[model samples]
Target: SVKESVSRIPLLKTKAGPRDGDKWTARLKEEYASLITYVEHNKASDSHWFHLESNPQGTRWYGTCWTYYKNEKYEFEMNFDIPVTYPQAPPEIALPELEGKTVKMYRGGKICMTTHFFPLWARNVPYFGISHVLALGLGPWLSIEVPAMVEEGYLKP
Candidate 1:
């Protein structure tokens, strides 16, 4: 379940952004810690689906996420910024490789999250971080969108 995947991740404790200087490093560490746990969980469950890395400041992240659908590999490049008002502002994840591939996305490949995501993120503000967004946001988006694209013949093997 998507919710279950998120529950297993460690929520971030720091709320500082890059503007906070020293404190931003603290928050960055928390971010890495949470991400590490997320990776381990995926490995343990044999559900590995993505890879990610951040900029030196840990403000920008980029990666690839792939799924095996109909025995074919569907891969995409994804990236997002840690908004200056992060913890309060949800990251706008973009699937750069899929631009114009589907209407479920916004201009420039930003994934258009479901209505439920924002409210839920608002409730978990200051707790949810990249890992949470990946599980709650990108994970489900891929499941729903990719299969449709594959079936529609928009995505070829």
Candidate 2:
């Protein structure tokens, strides 16, 4: 099923190069391309995903994908276990990089995103796909109140 589903989703393929372990790497190449194009075509600030690194062990699957502002920055890192039955199971994602930051939508290592849409209604959702889930889970179920909890002001590099 994963093989079949994977074949159909070109975007997923672009983001990852075959599930390496319990997780798949984000299609940083594609995300980077889009970031460059957005700035160049729109004559916008040079915002792009930086500090792109991957776990060498392939066991700890995590990386940073972001769009930085001149004075502000938003960096997102995802950690997940790629299940054998991927696409059918939602991978665990958290802002481990944000750790002690005051991000409003995260708790401990779990995100505030609603789990209602998981498995039954939405299966095999990717890590990026959980952004919408995060938005939904914010406000009521989170420790912080604003989405800018992980901003530079809140987090010390």
Candidate 3:
């Protein structure tokens, strides 16, 4: 069948965490001020599936995240929020337009990063950032979620 692969695979995890205010404001500046930092760093050093967008408010790094395993070339829009209570918590990560379709998703489109995220973020909050969440948390998720969607024929492109 044109719709078949011997064994359609799920999205795979990627190789790849946070916090505090003074620490909060500082963290925001760290991420926000240098919008190109992660993008530039990754473009040259790694193979993750995302790139930072033009800076906005020093608290967000908007971008399109595409997955190699998606049924089609999909640039899933996502944004990372730097919390005022950062370092104490992991940054908020989400995928818009993908809400309520999957059990793993959150109420406000936030990706559920509790399993692997909480532990690492808790331990290294101050040292982590949106880059870690995307590369480790959401990037890995793409490996699983998109492939499952493809295999079930959930989406047609």
Q: In order, what lDDT does every prediction score? A: 0.88, 0.40, 0.58
Compose the digit string of candidate 1's lDDT tens values, residues 30-72: 8899999999999999898999988899999998999889787
Pick by lDDT: 2 or 3, better one: 3
Alpha carbon RMSD to native, model 2: 9.1
Cα distance off (Å), candidate 3, residue 83: 1.6
lDDT of 3 by residue, 2-81 (tens): 11210121121211112332544555555443334545544554544676664534555577787765335656788876
Q: What's model 2's TM-score?
A: 0.40
- The order of the candidates by TM-score, greatest first, is 1, 3, 2
In model 2, the worst 10-residue window by lDDT is: 131-140
- Overall local distance difference test of candidate 1: 0.88
In terms of lDDT, model 2 sits at: 0.40
Highest lDDT model number: 1
Give the CA lDDT, 0 to 100, for residue 84 in model 3. 49
TM-scores for all candidates: the values are 0.95, 0.40, 0.69
TM-score of 3: 0.69
